Design a protein around this ligand. Structure first.
Ligand SMILES: O=c1[nH]c(=O)n([C@@H]2O[C@H](CO)[C@@H](O)[C@H](O)[C@H]2O)cc1Br
Ligand SMILES: O=c1[nH]c(=O)n([C@@H]2O[C@H](CO)[C@@H](O)[C@H](O)[C@H]2O)cc1Br
Lengths: 807, 807
């Protein structure tokens, strides 16, 4: 069908079909009379996986032959989504398989819908890992992601009476045709025990052993025949009344059972710390073994790079020491030079509540040697500090890896800064904030460590895969080179005044909308109007992301309609979606509000189809690939200073949505790239937020000076949105009036004005789309290939390579 | 190489090798430089499984086409062992694969050794199930085995200081290439709840749901292209703070976790009852669904047969009623006619302690409706009894399905007899005992129900697979027809006086011995003498099987050697092996004795290599295939009246070992078949045991009249066999002297005399072997093909068929 999807050569289409049949018959053990579409999906997944493998064995060979420096990306989260269509695209099988499956009388897109998402992540941090892998492969880096094979991923969200219900994501139920179990490289991981000092030094003894069994999943580059590995560990109890002893094997395997579902919130539970050590321990042995097939650890950092994805794998640092000091018998000072030279750290937040500070008493019981190492590290660090700022006892207390208070904690961030050679933020404003505020002391000590790597996203999933109609019309004008050189989208800038291109851009957006409205009725019986502006905010539910502010705009548009029913307004479909962590009471109330506004607004006959408020259930990677292509307005409205970067924002820029946002995180760089003219920016800057905080935020003030806002609150307090429980939302109203750490009212007024300008521009189709053209054409910087190239050069010290490996 | 193993056609050997390579590469994702012998094993297992599948899909089709009566074999146990070599043999690939793997530079027998046993059974009962499946397939019956897919099978036994240690059998660790997971036919099973009576009858409500997910394993007939199914259920929790709620999913999945390891002993634990209901519930729905693709349940028994393997699946009877009465709305009397006509029951013991008597309070809590059904059944049964024996209130109390006492029990056996149309014992003497003693009342009521089906074993595993050298020399003389017509071995009777055949039989036995002695040194550094008589007793450790009596003979041979060191004795290697249930204190002591005798006898320099006592670790199917071919003397020495049939005994008859045994179980029929002349029979008959019991067994008497025995006991009491714990065996001595339910001393004297005659015959090689010839040639009756044909005709009402299905 479309050009970007590759060749359907008579040759390939014939070989693909017999492999489909071979798999249906031998692998699936079904015949054409009993096969369900699920069996067809699998037969196709095994058929396409067949093409990866030869390439997979050859890449892993090459790396043995050539022995390059290896990159290890440690993350507790890899939010991968579906793999089928991704693999077809990176391999150029898409048009062939489409031919093949058509000739067999199947619709491929119907089959693609059967694949479960691999939801082994919560949001932005886990998905960044996922994009980063795609980019490492595409750029020919010798790179492995290590994490955990959770048997249950982020829960599936159900709405029952406008409340979230959580059910288990049982993604493995039907098998994972992408992974290959690797029981022959199972390794032991150790817990508890106690430390023994001998003549020959410390020994960690009487430990409980959990085995770590790896699963490998292929990660293919874009058309370069590189296939890298994602290795995930699973927990296995070792083989050493009887009935009970067997059932208790489960206690050890609970380690890899389930992903902790809290995003941007630290809970200091033990099970979590065990998961953190588990991946760190199994991975470092795998790393050192690979190194040992090159006594001499001086070359370790020329051969190994370890990237810490937030502080989740921070124990990699004392564990690397433990191994080097206790088992390999290097001397401390040398072990410490190898460590610092090996590891580097990426910070993803400045929210106090998001930072890991583990209680000393947990680490003592569970990891007694590692606590000893951490005290040694801290002591020698403080002596460097003391030596550089003589007599500054305050600095010593602040910078310490050990926090005093009613329970001592280890501040995991302080450990990563100390034991890493580079520390980076994830957008320019974010990294400045780091240097100016929370890591100020560490910056003054070691300025050379601090860097910036503005996040990106992969153009393969986020354009080519989910917006083939747009990738197509872009490719008719400028070729295909851009899919791995997103900087080339600038060439589109000279098309801004082209009547044909304008109409094609708008046409594609219109088609995407028509598809999405149809998915909405088919799968959830919800009846939108595809001619409205699609105003969407999708992301995890959090006070800092300010969904509430979005709510207050919505209620406003609706109060203004009721006040003058016969006046013309631009119609909108407001779409909000995201999961709330199960214990996060406020976030769960916010979901309830959104649907409650829906029950009122969606059934007012005066409103017409001028305004609909939809709550999108189960927001996830695969739902993102559907709603992002179909959006007109992208909501990125966090309080200045709190959203480290955002990546949702980039997905939307790239797919012809316009952005309304605060000067936060990567928003600052996006508007910088497209020009502030072509962006809808509003509200406080970081500086204004600080001015507010010194003086004191008092929300009453806004309540008294803004009648529109006063009215909304009165409707919230009195039950206008909850007739059978008049007091339902007193927590929200109360938090808004007295305890709002994120200043929703302070941006209310500016946000509503900005929103009127969005409507204004929307009324002139031609001018909306040229502004679109202008964003799409400047989104190049936000490719993860750009981010990874910076990591590669400025941190890991390896050269990217776009060169093909032989077929 | 050998003739019986099939053709190595240039054609097949070429196609097999490329499939080996295709699997190594695509399925295993390995290349020829990293592959371990384990990868080679797997590549071959998938290559051979490929040939099963087309045949598998075609058999299941045929049954749809032709709609025959279906046989359901319900067992909690299927002791299958290895599958590779079995599949090659039933399919005729053995010589080809042997060629193929040789040309690739691999030794196939080395690969075969890597396959884990599927130890989903304890001993005779689980293995009978396994042989029966092979025979149903070979005889073209439309037959399914249903059971449970235990994640851990019978524990692996380790010996540490001559004590048993149990470790988990983690048989799934590396994957099972034989099964095919079938998540699309997952079914719900219900527990707990409570019963509600309406106008419309009873409803079982507020239940806990466990899902049952099936796994299918292929069961191929011998060269007839029939491939039947073994379906095993696995436990799955359904999908409906949060962390804990997820981990607790394990509680529901513990149902299929592990096989209860007690053989011939009832433990009334809840987990066990849940397993019993689980398989019964999931299976009956699968059965009724299959029936529903033929309102009208009158044809149910013409279409369905359910075989109960002991009382383990006895709930099939009230569950069949529950479904028919409560859900299908048949009236009671009609539902009861369908049930009785559908089910039949096989009893495997008369030991009181082995019978299931489930406490009422367990069944009330867990299965409240089924208890109501059982009371209804019992009431109407007692009214039939009352009506036939007016005023016999004693009979009423004895025959009741409900046993009174400090805790009420349901006697599961009484339920099976009542709700089945046939009840059978597993050897002729066993079925007589049934009719004369424990089921006497039920016999007087319904004589037409009681039958006999003497057990058999499959000649494919138990001759062709484990004794190719013997199968070979048998086949040079009489052809190959005998492998599925074991009755043809009689033709060997006219070879008893053939000097060439004599020497071939003896030669094969000698080779088998040489192999086994070499396996003994290689895998366990134990140094036997292959010229000795191989005296073996292998089977589970139980007081009734009288390993102790074997011990006392051993100690005797050794005391006689010490008394006259310079006299000539026939050398022996005594080999005893078997697992003891983990809580069975006495059985664990017996293992300790055996090794203790080993520490003394094996290191007396006077004994020489005249006597060695070996304890064989980890007795299992795959160890049986090795030691049975290599044995000269088969020990089958249970107290008359206690071993229901035995099947170990038949394995040995068929493999040229001679039997020393009591007149017990199938021994009576074996000696009947070969002639008492050609069998070494000794000890009490059942009648003598009863004479003893009336008078009173008093073991002191034997102690006083037999100085040899007195001496053995004195050595046991005083620490001769345990120098550092003089009191170690006081439990054994004490049990022997005062509390022996199995009369070891009463057979001592007769057993030792009989043993001297075995030695005598052993000294004349020529006469030993002709006696061998005589046993092998009469073993025909003991084929499971004979047993299954009887089941088929006399119970299930279907015609066996030896006819091939098209290739
Ligand atoms: O727990 C977390 N979860 C998460 O999604 N992020 C996100 O990390 C993404 C990747 O860096 C960023 O774009 C977002 O600004 C940031 O919130 C950070 C933490 Br810390
Ligand atoms: O729990 C049991 N385990 C077992 O192996 N059998 C055996 O059943 C075999 C199969 O019928 C028979 O040959 C043996 O005599 C009998 O002991 C019976 C019970 Br009941």
């Amino acid at each position: 069908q479309i050009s970007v999807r590759g060749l359907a050569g008579v040759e390939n289409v014939t070989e693909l079909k017999k492999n489909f049949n071979r798999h249906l018959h031998f692998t699936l053990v079904k015949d054409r009379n009993v096969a369900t579409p699920r069996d067809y999906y699998f037969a196709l997944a095994h058929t396409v996986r067949d093409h990866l493998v030869g390439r997979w064995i050859r890449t892993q060979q090459h790396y043995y032959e050539k022995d390059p420096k290896r990159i290890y990306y440690l993350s507790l989260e890899f939010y991968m989504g579906r793999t089928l269509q991704n693999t077809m695209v990176n391999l150029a099988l898409e048009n062939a398989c489409d031919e093949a499956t058509y000739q067999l009388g199947l619709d491929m897109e119907e089959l693609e819908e059967i694949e479960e998402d691999a939801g082994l992540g919560n949001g932005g941090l886990g998905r960044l890992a996922a994009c980063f892998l795609d980019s490492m492969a595409t750029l020919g880096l010798a790179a492995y992601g290590y994490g955990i094979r959770y048997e249950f991923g982020i829960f599936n969200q159900k709405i029952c009476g406008g409340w979230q219900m959580e059910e288990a994501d049982d993604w493995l139920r039907y098998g994972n045709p992408w992974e290959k179990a690797r029981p022959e490289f199972t390794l032991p991981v150790h817990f508890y025990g106690r430390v023994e000092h001998t003549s020959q030094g410390a020994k960690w003894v009487d430990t409980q052993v959990v085995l770590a069994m790896p699963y490998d999943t292929p990660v293919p580059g874009y058309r370069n025949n590189v296939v890298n590995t994602m290795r995930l560990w699973s927990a296995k109890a070792p083989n050493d009344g009887y009935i009970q002893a067997v059932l208790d094997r489960n206690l050890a395997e609970n380690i890899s059972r389930v992903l902790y579902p809290n995003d941007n919130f630290f809970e200091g539970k033990e099970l979590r710390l065990k998961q953190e050590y588990f991946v760190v321990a199994a991975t470092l042995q795998d790393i050192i073994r690979r190194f040992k097939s090159s006594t001499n650890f001086d070359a370790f950092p020329d051969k190994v790079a370890i990237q810490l994805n937030d502080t989740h794998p921070s124990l990699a640092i004392p564990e690397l020491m433990r191994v080097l000091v206790d088992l390999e018998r290097l001397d401390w000072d040398k072990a410490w030079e190898v460590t610092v030279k090996t590891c580097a750290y990426t910070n993803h937040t400045v929210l106090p509540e998001a930072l890991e500070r583990w209680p000393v008493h947990l680490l003592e019981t569970l990891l007694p040697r590692h606590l000893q190492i951490i005290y040694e590290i801290n002591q020698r660090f403080l002596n460097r500090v003391a030596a550089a700022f003589p007599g500054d006892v305050d600095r010593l207390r602040r910078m310490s890896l050990v926090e005093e208070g009613a329970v001592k904690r280890i501040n995991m961030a302080h450990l990563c800064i100390a034991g890493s050679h580079a520390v980076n933020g994830v957008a320019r404003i974010h990294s400045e904030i780091l240097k100016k505020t929370i890591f100020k002391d560490f910056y003054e000590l070691e300025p050379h460590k601090f860097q910036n790597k503005t996040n990106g996203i992969t153009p393969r999933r986020w354009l080519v895969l989910c917006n083939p109609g747009l990738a197509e019309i872009i490719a008719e004008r400028i070729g295909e080179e851009y899919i791995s050189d997103l900087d080339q989208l600038r060439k589109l800038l000279s098309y801004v005044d082209d009547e044909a291109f304008i109409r094609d851009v708008a046409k594609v957006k219109q088609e995407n909308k028509l598809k999405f409205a149809a998915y909405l009725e088919r799968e959830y019986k919800v009846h939108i109007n595809p001619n409205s502006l699609f105003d969407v905010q999708v992301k995890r539910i959090h006070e800092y992301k300010r969904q509430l502010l979005n709510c207050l705009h919505v209620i406003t548009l609706y109060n203004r309609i009721k006040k003058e029913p016969n006046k013309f307004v631009v119609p909108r479909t407001v779409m909000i979606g995201g999961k709330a962590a199960p214990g996060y009471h406020m976030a769960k109330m916010i979901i309830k509000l959104i649907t409650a506004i829906g029950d009122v607004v969606n059934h007012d006959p005066v409103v017409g189809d001028r305004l609909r408020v939809i709550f999108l259930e189960n927001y996830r990677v695969s739902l993102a690939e559907k709603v992002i292509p179909a959006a007109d307005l992208s909501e990125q409205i966090s309080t200045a200073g709190t959203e480290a970067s955002g990546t949702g924002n980039m997905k939307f820029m790239l797919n012809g949505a316009l952005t309304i946002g605060t000067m936060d995180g990567a928003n600052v760089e996006m508007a910088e790239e497209a020009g502030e003219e072509n962006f809808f920016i509003f509200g406080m800057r970081v500086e204004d937020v600080d001015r507010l905080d010194q003086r004191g935020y008092n929300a009453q003030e806004y309540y008294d000076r803004i009648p529109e806002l006063r009215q909304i609150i009165e409707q919230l307090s009195s039950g206008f949105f909850s007739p059978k429980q008049p007091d339902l939302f007193k927590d929200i109203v109360n938090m808004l009036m007295h305890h709002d750490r994120f200043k929703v009212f302070a941006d209310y007024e500016e946000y509503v004005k900005c929103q009127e300008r969005v409507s204004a521009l929307y009324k002139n189709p031609r001018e909306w789309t040229r502004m679109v053209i202008r964003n799409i054409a400047t989104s190049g910087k936000f490719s993860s290939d750009r981010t990874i190239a910076q990591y590669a050069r400025e941190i890991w010290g390896v050269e990217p390579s776009r060169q093909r490996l032989p077929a």
